[PDB]
């Protein structure tokens, strides 16, 4: 059993591509959360062992170890080391898992862990010449998609884009467009209800951005990706992304900017400081699957995590499965034997509404599950993301109070 | 106490910039090692839990999670996950530490962990437009050096390049140019001695590369960066890279291509299959320091790891401190109260001779310390690297 | 004596950098003028010999021979050849000069000639690798300035930017900041008066641009660079561009998009069609000067052109000297023995007001001088531009009617 | 009748892509020729009126008015102006035509005119962002081919590459693959014959280039693109670049580096200095054609220039039609009523052997026709090039 406790966390609002957070460097966006948690946790900054951040890109302002650039820029001590982790879409969850394992081994009492991604500010990348005056230029957008693909990998596994893998899972496990759109509508609706109830109040750190003009600042307080007008009716109208396909711009997540960080520690440091944790990390699991069906990653990761945690799915009160594509979430739910509309599933909305800043999303799921656990009868939550090139990562947590 | 065993490992030869491995994609470099260990460890490939690779770049062919792309391209099974780790210069050691912690927690019985870099094949990176028809273009070489530097970081901590941090450390801890150049001489001489004694034979997997003559292949068996001719007299003749400085092209490591991977597991999986481990991982420590003095990271890293392993520096038989710059190694040695010439230190040579493919180096120090330990009496080794922006990482291992 | 006649011409409005014309390809912007002149001149399109356009860039949408891409895209016949000319800032005048020389030799009866530049849409340029896996990248903005400079040229001649050459000429020929700003104010004022009198009516072809939204078009009717609020008082406040310098953002021209084309022919084709020309081209001259003093280029080009034309400066009723920097215009005027406020000089405004789309400006000066000649007593106009790296080009014309 | 004289001229050897001249900047290539002619013509450098250079690219070191940068860098005086001209493939011939017209008008007595290209050193070009954080990046090789193509042009005229226009012409005018390959064989054989007879001796200025061995220089004296081994049997064995097509890597010119410049003046400046001209320029003609069939541009260009020169094709002793693709030359020959094997046509070899540095080629045809005319009885030569996007340019010259 892992033995690490979630004491606190914060996230930025998630911005649209070229949106509300497009002017903020990914190291500054992570730095804001790291600075605010250091200042307000109750713990001594000198008890901090390490900062671990997920980031799927690392070509840009997020290069040369985002975690350490971010903690220095935010004014945390030079004595505090950091490390950046990449497991694509599961990066923010894998950083928390790595901190939880360190803690459970007795190597540090207190870690900051999460993820950050500026998909707006992701650079163009250009291959070096293989010979003098070479005429071949490979130029890629690092925002998203395959770049410099290995021909040996492509020959074994194909070149399906992430949306195409959603259509694959829809075909493989028999998920209809109607069910996908019904799930997409309920993600938007569940976000809107949670927002109205005040669910996000203590979860979001608003971000001051340049408002243009000169000297003018604006406060970003709110998630920018949600489309409350996207009801079933509007989603049913949208074209497929591909011919004979089920995935649309409406039942898929989007490209986004955002950061999310949690503070983890052993039980003893909280006992010594008189600070109560939100939740205990019990177990994690990582699995590989066929790249073309990457979206069913979570089914096997969830079963292995529950088995390591010694609990049954019926003891779980709250399920965060990242909503990359509505059809891959429904496919996971089907394979786990759950109804498409199970009320435990992303009960405050998911990525269809909130967006998917790759490195940050798994860390948002950790924080939102720990917070959501405080409002329900059952003790356990599972958090899970599918991963590009076919992986699943899952983590089980338990409410403390 | 960590509870992970090193069972096996292999590294490529380390190539010079645009050198013997410049044609090999970094995922393929890593993949060659993943495949050969999968095929020859004596463990079932199905017990492998995860592949953890250090990589400082991740902008190019090493992008989008090198670990997973490398294991798929090498033909390991699709069921096997992977993740990539970046702690700059300590990346390959941090990958092994994370796999060791995973194992120590009971989360999988068997991990492949190491690092890879193609500093040859690192791409150019170019900022997005911050406005329509912007005339601002920020273009950088991802090979090495600060790119898209943060203004708030530069204001608090400066913009010193890594060689300058070497001079800063030399100045701060009083390390003569002569002592630096002797250390650099010893590293070249120690590499050449170990090479002729056959020390590297089962450490290196040779790599088959195109020679370019419409079908012609060449086998790279040997580290390309060593300079046997570099004796104390030759090194004293070279100029400092910066005025008032003690750091030269000759007492500094280089820019390099290469990969290194180890197989770690729990005790029980070795016992069940009748395979003995080389060494046990006992402890690790990561510390931050002033970025300006990043070179002395190892000192506190080494002391914390020894205190966590419950041993004295006197019980150590083998010390692998990465040779980013001769003067930062000597400063770390002075800070720990060791002679500049202590024969436990980089006894088979170091990065001055072998080179520094950043992601791969820490994984190389794990492998070579685990191998080196088999040959000596004292049963403990320390492995440590300084890290750009001011970190030290150290690991303690015990011969089985 | 040259023997070529200006029958017609048109220009686009000149747009600011990322301004009113930033969405229009330079080949389309030239194509609009070439199409409108073909359709409205009175001449048969089949009598057209050739299209000659100035363009200082040719790396972008203006690459691979702008003139021929432009005439094809505008729907002129495949039978009509074209050629693109580059003499930096004098490119649009040099294209007219080359057409005038062809005509005067009897090689074609009718030419379209001018220039075009999209400084907005100018690409980034990146050097090929000199060796496999080379780490040196030379990346340049082709909008403006030195790119891939020759070290042998830089060692003989220095690396002074164009604004710095203005400060050089100000120092060399004793032009005060006060006189520069007085000239800049009167360029803005003379533009504003000409606009109010209707001077530009028959000179400008308005351009339909995408207005954003979707389906929305807007008509660009007016020059976008003029600053009528720039009076002496406002210009006196502005900082120098360089320390101890005289050139400012206000007494220098700017970066601009625009095209300008004239229709030239022999006298006989106009006699046969019953179409009267505006003016006769008499002579041109090209000179080189020291790169660092490039702005006095026009003094010697003007004297040689007047000498070839067999006229005296006192017979000239109209002088267009391109206003690259107010101090280089004043330096030319001083060297020619003219007052700074000579009323013949750019009497409808110059580039300080109108902007400087490099390839187009010399062709605007040809068209605006031919049109301006129709409103004055004296028969002759001289048109002249200074050129980057130290050249002067001048042309003398004579009113026909 | 034009009234300009060709007094002198020189060209570099033409290099292969990444070949013998790939280290020479195009301004330096042009500058070497400008300087040697300035120093050895026997004319005063002070009577030179202007330098006119053809260049199809102008994105790179050839940017910002190659003529002026080349003459300053070569040490010609700052008083000497220059301009660059682009009519794609006819650029170098169009530069000479424009200088000839200038002279014919009485605007200067003496011009340097030609062309230069470094297709080796042509840069990559990259579109500006059309919106903040745009994900659209258009990147092209300026070496050759359509870049930032206009949608309205593609809709009316298609997107056929130059080799495809060769196939289109072959198909349209019925040119066999066999005839194409024989022409390509004759060009290689005719180049090798002229080389061994010493025809190129005073045409080529050798170029000194770095060999790369810390100070080592090599003299390039010889055209690098010729393939003497390419006989009719070898050429018939190669595949078409496109299905149904007759165009191969062997009956098409290549991608190349090189420069060519001539000295033109009026009659009186020769008479005043006692220097005889090689030839008089009599006339030129530029025509447009369908872009799809750009290869047959020369036909009408040649007929209009002959009519302007007042001569019959029967009075011509020498015909330089640029060999972009064997089949477009043969189509032009059929359209003019000439045998495929007429010995007046590219008698010393053509672009199939010599290569096609686009800007330089037309300037090379002027120089080689002016030199070739000295050796033969008929006193007229025609020079012509087809042009991408559908143009033909031709010039008629007379031996003095």
């Amino acid at each position: 059993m892992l033995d690490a406790y979630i004491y606190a966390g914060l996230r930025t609002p998630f911005g649209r591509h070229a949106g509300a957070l497009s002017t903020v460097r990914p190291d500054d966006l992570a730095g804001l959360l790291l600075a605010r948690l250091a200042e307000t946790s109750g713990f001594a900054v000198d008890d901090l062992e390490d900062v671990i951040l997920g980031c799927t890109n690392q070509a840009g302002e997020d290069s040369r170890n985002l975690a350490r650039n971010a903690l220095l820029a935010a004014g945390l001590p030079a004595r505090l080391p950091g490390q950046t982790v990449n497991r694509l879409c599961a990066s923010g969850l894998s950083a928390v898992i790595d901190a939880a394992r360190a803690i459970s081994c007795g190597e540090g009492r207190l870690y900051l862990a999460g993820g950050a991604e500026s998909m707006s500010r992701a650079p163009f990348v250009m291959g070096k010449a293989e010979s003098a005056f070479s005429r071949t230029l490979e130029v890629f957008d690092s925002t998203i998609g395959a770049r410099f693909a290995n021909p040996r990998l492509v020959e074994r596994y194909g070149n399906d884009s992430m949306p195409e893998t959603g259509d694959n899972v829809a075909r493989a496990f028999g998920i209809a467009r109607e069910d996908a759109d019904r799930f997409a509508a309920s993600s938007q609706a569940r976000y809107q209800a949670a927002l109205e109830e005040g669910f996000f109040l203590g979860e979001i750190l608003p971000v001051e951005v340049r408002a243009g003009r000169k000297g003018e600042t604006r406060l970003v307080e709110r998630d920018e990706h949600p489309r409350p007008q996207a009801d079933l009716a509007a989603l049913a109208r949208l074209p497929a992304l591909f011919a004979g396909g089920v995935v649309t711009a409406g039942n898929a997540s989007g490209i986004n900017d955002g950061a999310a960080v949690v503070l983890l520690g052993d039980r003893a440091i909280g006992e010594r400081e008189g600070i109560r944790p939100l939740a205990r990390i019990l177990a994690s699991a990582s699995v590989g699957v066929e790249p073309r069906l990457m979206g069913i990653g979570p089914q096997q990761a969830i079963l292995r995590a529950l088995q390591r945690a010694g609990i049954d799915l019926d003891e779980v009160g709250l399920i965060e499965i990242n909503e990359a594509f509505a059809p891959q979430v429904l496919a996971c739910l089907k394979l786990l034997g759950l109804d498409y509309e199970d009320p435990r599933v992303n009960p405050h909305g998911g990525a269809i509404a909130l967006g998917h800043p790759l490195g940050a999303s798994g860390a948002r799921l950790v924080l939102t599950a720990a917070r959501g656990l405080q409002r329900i009868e059952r003790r356990y939550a599972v958090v899970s993301l599918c991963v590009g090139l076919g992986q699943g990562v899952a983590m089980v947590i338990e409410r403390c109070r």
Side-chain angles (χ1 to χ4, degrees), chain A:
Chain A
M1 210 63 70
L2 300 184
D3 197 36
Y5 300 76
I6 304 166
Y7 283 98
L10 281 169
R11 67 173 183 86
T12 69
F14 284 8
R16 289 181 155 268
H17 183 267
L21 295 175
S22 62
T23 66
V24 193
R25 293 167 55 96
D27 53 343
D28 287 333
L29 198 64
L32 290 165
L33 302 176
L34 292 170
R36 175 63 66 99
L37 288 170
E39 287 161 8
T40 64
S41 74
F43 290 104
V45 182
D46 286 349
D47 287 331
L48 280 171
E49 192 75 12
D50 208 358
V51 177
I52 311 188
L53 301 181
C55 185
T56 74
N57 189 313
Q58 307 192 47
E61 295 164 340
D62 49 349
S63 76
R64 298 188 73 242
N65 190 4
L66 169 74
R68 164 75 167 177
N69 298 330
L71 75 90
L72 286 172
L76 288 81
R79 62 151 281 288
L80 181 59
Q83 164 178 320
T84 305
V85 160
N86 186 350
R87 196 192 299 261
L88 287 194
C89 331
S91 292
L93 178 53
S94 295
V96 174
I97 291 173
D98 300 349
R101 289 163 174 185
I103 284 157
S104 302
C105 282
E107 296 216 320
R109 302 207 100 124
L110 206 69
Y111 279 78
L112 284 161
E117 205 82 60
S118 179
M119 298 184 83
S120 287
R121 300 182 72 75
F124 289 103
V125 179
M126 299 146 297
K128 286 269 171 62
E130 296 187 345
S131 41
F133 308 106
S134 167
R135 283 181 60 213
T136 44
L137 199 50
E138 275 192 321
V139 176
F140 289 101
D141 183 22
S142 77
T143 284
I144 200 163
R147 56 183 171 288
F148 303 107
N150 199 312
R152 287 163 147 100
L153 186 162
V154 169
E155 250 187 1
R156 301 166 187 279
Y157 294 115
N159 57 356
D160 287 358
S161 65
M162 296 290 270
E164 290 180 277
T165 74
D167 287 333
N168 291 349
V169 162
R171 287 199 324 283
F173 298 97
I175 299 90
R177 166 60 184 286
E178 291 71 40
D179 295 312
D181 286 344
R182 208 155 285 116
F183 183 88
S186 77
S187 176
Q188 301 288 1
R190 289 163 173 165
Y191 169 78
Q192 192 51 45
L195 177 64
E196 287 163 1
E197 277 142 26
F199 174 76
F200 294 108
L201 262 170
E203 181 173 305
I204 290 167
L205 184 67
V207 183
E208 268 208 81
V209 309
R210 208 213 317 115
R213 321 270 205 269
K214 220 152 64 216
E216 283 255 298
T217 93
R218 147 203 186 208
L219 198 65
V220 187
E221 273 183 310
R222 199 154 281 189
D223 292 308
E224 179 182 36
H225 207 251
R227 285 285 169 284
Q229 73 267 31
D231 52 11
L232 176 50
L235 292 162
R237 288 187 229 290
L238 292 170
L241 288 195
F242 299 87
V246 131
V247 171
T248 72
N251 67 27
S253 194
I255 297 165
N256 297 275
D257 308 335
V261 181
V262 299
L263 180 69
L264 301 322
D266 68 15
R267 195 177 45 203
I269 192 162
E271 290 177 342
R272 287 200 288 281
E273 300 283 359
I275 300 164
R276 277 184 245 209
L278 292 180
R280 179 188 175 168
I281 307 187
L282 290 189
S284 83
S286 289
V287 305
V289 295
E290 292 298 327
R292 73 181 299 279
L293 302 172
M294 67 99 205
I296 55 61
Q299 176 228 359
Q300 187 169 308
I302 284 167
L303 289 173
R304 293 184 77 213
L306 291 172
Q307 190 285 145
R308 289 173 166 168
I311 74 166
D312 256 295
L313 193 49
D314 62 44
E315 299 186 80
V316 171
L318 195 166
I319 304 176
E320 293 289 350
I321 293 172
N322 197 50
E323 308 176 343
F325 312 94
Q328 59 86 20
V329 180
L330 295 186
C332 291
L333 288 188
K334 191 164 170 169
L335 285 171
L336 285 167
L338 301 187
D339 300 305
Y340 292 160
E341 300 304 333
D342 195 307
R344 294 178 292 173
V345 179
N346 306 344
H348 311 296
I352 295 164
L354 285 162
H356 187 17
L358 302 183
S361 290
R364 180 182 68 73
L365 294 195
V366 171
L367 171 69
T368 216
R371 293 181 69 261
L373 256 186
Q374 302 314 309
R375 302 160 136 75
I376 70 176
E377 147 209 290
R378 282 176 288 189
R379 294 155 68 140
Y380 302 107
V382 62
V383 154
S384 194
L385 310 93
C386 64
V387 184
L389 278 312
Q391 315 188 228
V393 184
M395 190 178 74
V396 183
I397 72 176
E398 191 178 17
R399 178 176 62 256
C400 286
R401 294 157 183 154

